[PDB]
Ligand binder design. Sequence first.
Ligand SMILES: NC(=O)C1=CN([C@@H]2O[C@H](COP(=O)(O)OP(=O)(O)OC[C@H]3O[C@@H](n4cnc5c(N)ncnc54)[C@H](OP(=O)(O)O)[C@@H]3O)[C@@H](O)[C@H]2O)C=CC1
Ligand SMILES: NC(=O)C1=CN([C@@H]2O[C@H](COP(=O)(O)OP(=O)(O)OC[C@H]3O[C@@H](n4cnc5c(N)ncnc54)[C@H](OP(=O)(O)O)[C@@H]3O)[C@@H](O)[C@H]2O)C=CC1
Ligand SMILES: [Mn+2]
Ligand SMILES: [Mn+2]
Lengths: 403, 403
Amino acid sequence: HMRMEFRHNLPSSDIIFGSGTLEKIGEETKKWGDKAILVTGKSNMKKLGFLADAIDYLESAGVETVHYGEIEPNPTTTVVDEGAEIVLEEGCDVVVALGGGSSMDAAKGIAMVAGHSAEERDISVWDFAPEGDKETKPITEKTLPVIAATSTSGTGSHVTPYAVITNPETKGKPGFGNKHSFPKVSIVDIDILKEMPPRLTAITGYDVFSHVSENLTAKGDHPTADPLAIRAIEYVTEYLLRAVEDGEDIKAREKMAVADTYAGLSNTISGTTLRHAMAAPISGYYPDISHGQALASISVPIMEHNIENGDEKTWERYSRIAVALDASKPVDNTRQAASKAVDGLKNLLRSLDLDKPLSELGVEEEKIPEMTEGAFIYMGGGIEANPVDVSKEDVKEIFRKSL
Amino acid sequence: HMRMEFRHNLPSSDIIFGSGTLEKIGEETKKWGDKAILVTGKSNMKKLGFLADAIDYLESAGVETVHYGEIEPNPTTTVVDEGAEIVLEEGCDVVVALGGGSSMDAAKGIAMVAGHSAEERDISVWDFAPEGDKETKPITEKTLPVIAATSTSGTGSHVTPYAVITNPETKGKPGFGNKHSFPKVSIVDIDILKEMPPRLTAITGYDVFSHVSENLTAKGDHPTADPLAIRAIEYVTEYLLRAVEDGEDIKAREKMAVADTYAGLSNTISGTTLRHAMAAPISGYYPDISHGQALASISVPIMEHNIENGDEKTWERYSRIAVALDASKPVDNTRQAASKAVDGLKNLLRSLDLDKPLSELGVEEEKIPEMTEGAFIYMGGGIEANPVDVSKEDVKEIFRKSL
Ligand SMILES: NC(=O)C1=CN([C@@H]2O[C@H](COP(=O)(O)OP(=O)(O)OC[C@H]3O[C@@H](n4cnc5c(N)ncnc54)[C@H](OP(=O)(O)O)[C@@H]3O)[C@@H](O)[C@H]2O)C=CC1
Ligand SMILES: NC(=O)C1=CN([C@@H]2O[C@H](COP(=O)(O)OP(=O)(O)OC[C@H]3O[C@@H](n4cnc5c(N)ncnc54)[C@H](OP(=O)(O)O)[C@@H]3O)[C@@H](O)[C@H]2O)C=CC1
Ligand SMILES: [Mn+2]
Ligand SMILES: [Mn+2]
């Protein structure tokens, strides 16, 4: 018998879940600081009224608030570093996020820079970012505390340590974070999430499924993540399409928000693999491409490559995914049982209108070698976590099949 | 549709899992202090050699160590308070546990007292303990850091905040703890656990099942605990009897240790209910009765009372328990589907030789009113968490049926 070995690490988590829990954002933020920077996107929280409510709750709690409404999707180093300058200039002592993964990550990045800085700055978020064997800047308890109110049932970021930040000079899109950038308090408000439009619901929903399916197949044992990851896939298969077709189906929104929370906790304990490592350089080189659409367009080839080069332990993991996708009845540990995960995946992608080759997104074949370099330079951990080896030419070939 | 509302709170967790991970206890403990009190029982870790190894690893890591080998099962206030006096007298700055729930809880209690004390003491662990509406002493970050190496696949205590301490003057056996008494590092060593004898394996195994089955039926929503709790029941039904009948079946030991870890995390997020509230005063008044045997002997009547006074949401939870126990195929939300959990429970208890009326343990009918008082004075939270009301006379009647 093969013995089981692992180390589980999960930072403290405080999750306020329900509809109308945006109410709490002020009382909770005051516990951590008197002056917040409020990090958001440019239009939807404002248009939907939740920006005004957050500001109200924060001020009413006695938290003086500076609004930073500049996060565009796929946040950049420049936008983080400029928001950190504001934190230093205004004296903010806590970073509050109201938005999706792009806002929550930008917020964590701002907390990092501003917390480690001198008076005017002298450090960039990129100093914390992996890049080849570059020795990163340690991320320490100096990181400012982060309060995260998510608006998508998409990234898990309200309960992960990670920020995903793009450098436009290199096109890299790495993740980074640890226990000191995990949000102190996490607010999941169904009244905010249920306003996602159908397309956003489907994209962020697929992100949930992508996290947990990679978390389960990542190399080594990780049994504390696995039941959360499995249940999330069951919730995706049962509720995601319900949420897309009726945004006001509240049960379905609640299950996708629980599923998204599972995914963040599961992705903290375990980690993502090749699909994430390759989707980063796609949105890195093509910033108008949504993260989840990038994941979708390369999923089939990657799952097929991992199954073709796998072993019985990895095949059994893919067979549990197939079962959770309703693509099969019995779990088994063979190449063929595992291959049903590809059928269930295709079904999922079709029901969500996410099955698009990279061509239909605007990716061009000439970019392959650059994007392959991107994947190894900036997502080396995910390549290492993948259950089967890949060479630089494996990844080139995978990109071409996804075109 | 009934909206979903909850707050999830889980302290930081660091779990080192494998066989031979006792190796790590010194390096890990040194991160938190230079001088440990090592809290253990009186004979088995010593006899089995693990006491000598721990001391070796601690000293070899440069952690000067004072051994406190005085924890008897069902630890008392007196034993905690005397161990705290040693911590103060010797200057210890970190508390290390090597043992079962009794040692781990005693350790947490010692960390509490010694951390909040003046020079010689002036405070008892009982000051932190619930007791009616007595205003407890707040448990704060002054609590000393705790390193927990468990030796039973039984209590979850290596990953809960709680200490369960008996006051022999009152016979109360409450639990108490929060984020500041959650172990900083948790070591699960299969080489230690696989030495549990058959009877201890079965008793502590039933404790795992008791935690997660109450965690799942506790009042309100708690979806982040539920998948861990479910998987634990699946592991109990599939491996516990294997572990009892062959202590050297390592796969089975590993699954019960994962199940026990699930239970601790699940019991931190959610909570136990009436079965635990009533089993406390049994071991409180009869300290030679094992916690898990006490739980076993009152389970059938309690499950029947909760099912008889339940609703469809609680019935559905019991039906999932029945399915996880292999007592039934389809989950359903009726009184009858739920009642199959009682059949699966009876099967479990019989396969483990735990189905004994309280009489066969030495409990006497004359004690009922005292034990009922015990349950409300000292386990009020669990009564409140139970999915159906109970009066003081409900609990008296339940005790009599279990006799
Ligand atoms: N663990 C981590 O740190 C992870 C990070 N990521 C990263 O997360 C980002 C995720 O972005 P994601 O959350 O998917 O979406 P984004 O945060 O990037 O932006 C979402 C878009 O949808 C709009 N929007 C957001 N919420 C709502 C809503 N409730 N109703 C209407 N419109 C809304 C936003 O409006 P506006 O423009 O007004 O904000 C914005 O235009 C990516 O950069 C990805 O790399 C992905 C996975 C995990
Ligand atoms: N979250 C919490 O804080 C919880 C706490 N509890 C409490 O936990 C305690 C649990 O006790 P539990 O862990 O069940 O058992 P105990 O720690 O009470 O003692 C176990 C007995 O078995 C012996 N022993 C322990 N490990 C081994 C081993 N690996 N091989 C051989 N002998 C062994 C001990 O030897 P020795 O005498 O040498 O130590 C002792 O005699 C109870 O007081 C209960 O109330 C219960 C559930 C949850
Ligand atoms: Mn993702
Ligand atoms: Mn118990």
